[PDB]
Amino acid sequence: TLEDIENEKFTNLEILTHLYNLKAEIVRRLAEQG
Amino acid sequence: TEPGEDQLSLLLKWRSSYIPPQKPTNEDEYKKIICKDISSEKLEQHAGDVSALFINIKWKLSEGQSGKSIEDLKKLAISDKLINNGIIFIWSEKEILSQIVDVLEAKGFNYIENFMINQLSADKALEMQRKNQWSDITPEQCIEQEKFPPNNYVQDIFVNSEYSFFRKSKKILLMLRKFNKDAQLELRHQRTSDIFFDIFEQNKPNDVSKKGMEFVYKMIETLLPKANYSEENKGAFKMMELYADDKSQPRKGWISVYEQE
Amino acid sequence: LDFTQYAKNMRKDLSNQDICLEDGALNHSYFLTKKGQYWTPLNQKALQRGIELFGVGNWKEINYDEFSGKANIVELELRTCMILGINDITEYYGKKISEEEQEEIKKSNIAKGKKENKLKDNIYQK
Amino acid sequence: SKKGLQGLLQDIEKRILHYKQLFFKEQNEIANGKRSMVPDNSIPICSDVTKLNFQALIDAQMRHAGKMFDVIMMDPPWQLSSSQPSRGVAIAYDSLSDEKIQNMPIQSLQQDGFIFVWAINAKYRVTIKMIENWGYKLVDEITWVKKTVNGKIAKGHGFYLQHAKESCLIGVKGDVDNGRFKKNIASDVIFSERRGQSQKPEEIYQYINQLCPNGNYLEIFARRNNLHDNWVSIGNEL
DNA sequence: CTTAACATCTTAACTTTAA
């Protein structure tokens, strides 16, 4: 999801690499769809 | 505060739950084993196989202390005609803690848990209340009643001791287990926290109130469920207290050892 | 005896390199990050020399000659973003730039940021 | 649902732009000279105490202040439930045996002063034995009562009783009767909140500084939470 | 000897619900 990595207990770099891995997940999903 | 709910009254809500029972008069549940001197009294002769030992001993902190020193603990006798599977509940201090536990482990009992009482001075409560502002009241009737001063910061209220180190506000009771073979101990534990705040008196902190001693007694009673009265403690009770007084000690299911003068 | 010079002497003697500074002062930049995720000046110089040593864009071979540890790719890209001064790295692929011209176009990027009149925390956007 | 994850990806781009700007601002104020909560006089050391070279610490402390440590604090990593207790408290750090804690030299680090060892219920006798064989003599006990966010006793699970306390034992080493080490100070009971995992209250440092003002302090098994002023602090994750 | 699994608890924060 998107709201599970937005925690106030999470430091900014950890959040940001979570969103980067999440972009990797969307990129692979679009590769699968195409 | 306004509805009579502060930090003090939030921690002193147990006091209205516990009420001292009347003196038993059955001649079936109180054992009078009064002798001249316990150190001069031969133990394990009338009692037997108890599972909760209470030693209400006033410790000799220094020369001027009017109590019993640890040499009276050295002369104590505990054998197999005495507490065998049970637990000792003994008052302990900080100066003689190492010697107390070391001499108790020379008899078989080893430490298990702690249970202390946070002293809150009633005199400090009324003095802080009258400084913030409830007069003509000594803390004795404050002990006997529930009319306690309001206090939202309770760390100021503690008793002022006279230690030559960190000041003393502590009434730690030491619990010591006597593990034995081929006999499981029936316990009903986790029913009471190790800390409860209790109100004490200024310049006289070496005693717990009637309700506090009731709290300790009921703690022991719910801790070991088979040592209280279930249709079988006829004479041979499974709980005994040493030293005692004519204040709270004669109990249904409790052997009381006195100290003749 | 004061405790300031005392503290500097203790830190200069037995404290770690990432905790004390060169004169013994406290490295405060290390104590507001996590443990092991601090960006050391040695790591900074390693990234600066590895930009020229190997190719740019792909950071796998950059991480090969890096400290081989807490050197995740995303943080390397995100700090090179401020090293060179822009967020668009994908359009700068295949460009090997040394430290002098890195400072040159960093100054140029900050300058064009202050001309475009929407500069945000000394970083030019694209 | 192509549009669904496409819109998710656009939201991802917006959030990453937001966080990139957030961390860029953080790095810019780091380079600008932002100061942390750690006081400027703290002396942190980050190494395993099993592998630490206490000779260097002894030499430096002797050669700088002209005196040794006058207070040692200790929060040993006792052996409890590791990461999934399944009924009670997790203890989210490594545990040290009693032999390993006993091995390290403490009697060399002091000649006159106090020690502060925080014991748990299972390791009360063990702590007494440690500080009795190190040369110290058991003198005092400091207990931390844990209150909760609205100001009542915070009870935690136990075996015989519910546990709502924490124990610290204090043994002196040598001469105390000097200008330092003021007597009849503070209280043995610290009534304070539960501000973290095994995080002792900040009032213990206030009581220590009341015990001996502007002294030479050592503290093994440290985290960034305290890192106090004029304190030498050894830790693993410092 | 060490890890994993046992009850025999209390309290605050989050979630759902009738008003």
Added chain:
DNA sequence: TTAAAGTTAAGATGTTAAG
């Protein structure tokens, strides 16, 4: 919205089977 209960996660527990 609102306060009023259900539900859940957190607390530096001691003892015992299983290799």
